């Protein structure tokens with residue numbers, strides 16, 4: 001990854017805590033007002049952090065992510081026990097890394113929930129569960145394979161944001177990012193041509209099944225010289241042999257350029273969900289009250305037909321498959 005891809009925020013700690021101190025303490029009681037307050041704070045971010053975010057937002061980067069480090073997370077003993085259920089309690093007090101997702105998220109765009117997913121909530125806790133389905137972010141011992149988040153969804157978000165309150169005990173779990181800007185040079189022009197703008201059948205995540213490959217996903221699309229990426233190692237279901245072979249080439253190229261990010265407390269990862277695919281490698285939970293704990297939100301921006309007018313940060317949208 002490039003120098004500019006990692007932003008050390010430790011010098012900003014007091015300023016960021018001051019911004020958090022004026023946000024509503026019980027965000028889920030009035031999420032729209034909470035995120036409006038966070039938008040006001042976003043305009044007051046430290047100049048260097050605001051600039052890094054704005055630059056990345058304009059047109060992503062070669063790496064496809066922005067990693068903020070050293071944000072003012074609570075000490076471990078000042079955090080509650082790691083959640084073991086979803087959705088979160090409506091009265092749960094705001095945590096510092098959630099405040100960062102609010103302020104840094106509003107600098108980028110509009111927080112978005114998905115009605116059928118995690119009870120239609122905007123803030124997701126990402127924690128291990130002992131019976132996790134293999135297509136669940138609650139997995140641990142089994143690799144969560146590469147996916148563009150909701151690539152099959154008409155209202156797919158520009159960004160996935162992951163903020164770390166607890167790492168896993170052994171700091172083993174790696175968040176993998178595969179950037180199409182790094183992978184594309186490894187893909188032959190002939191395979192690029194087969195992938196580009198070609199809709200292929202795609203299954204959907206369990207939350208959206210209510211059924212087979214009810215969506216169509218274009219693995220590459222947009223500008224052929226700098227394409228967007230829609231990839232899902234588990235759900236993409238090409239039928240034609242040439243399509244299966246083209247996707248296999250794409251899949252191996254993303255593997256070869258994959259970068260591993262190990263999230264630690266105070267880290268916040270912004271993933272460009274139109275140009276990357278992401279994964280999480282195995283770890284072993286201990287069920288001791290201190291298991292790995294991320295906070296996840298989704299951000300929409302005004303491009304790629306994510307928005308059609310009037311949307312607000314906090315909106316929850318219904319499922320429509322890409323066709």
Ligand SMILES: N=C(N)NCCC[C@@H](C(=O)O)N1CCC1=O
Pocket residue numbers: 117135136137138145146147149150205206207232233234235
């Ligand atoms: N290749 C895949 N699709 N893996 C499952 C993604 C994780 C899943 C979850 O949060 O449990 N998810 C992301 C949107 C949604 O549902």
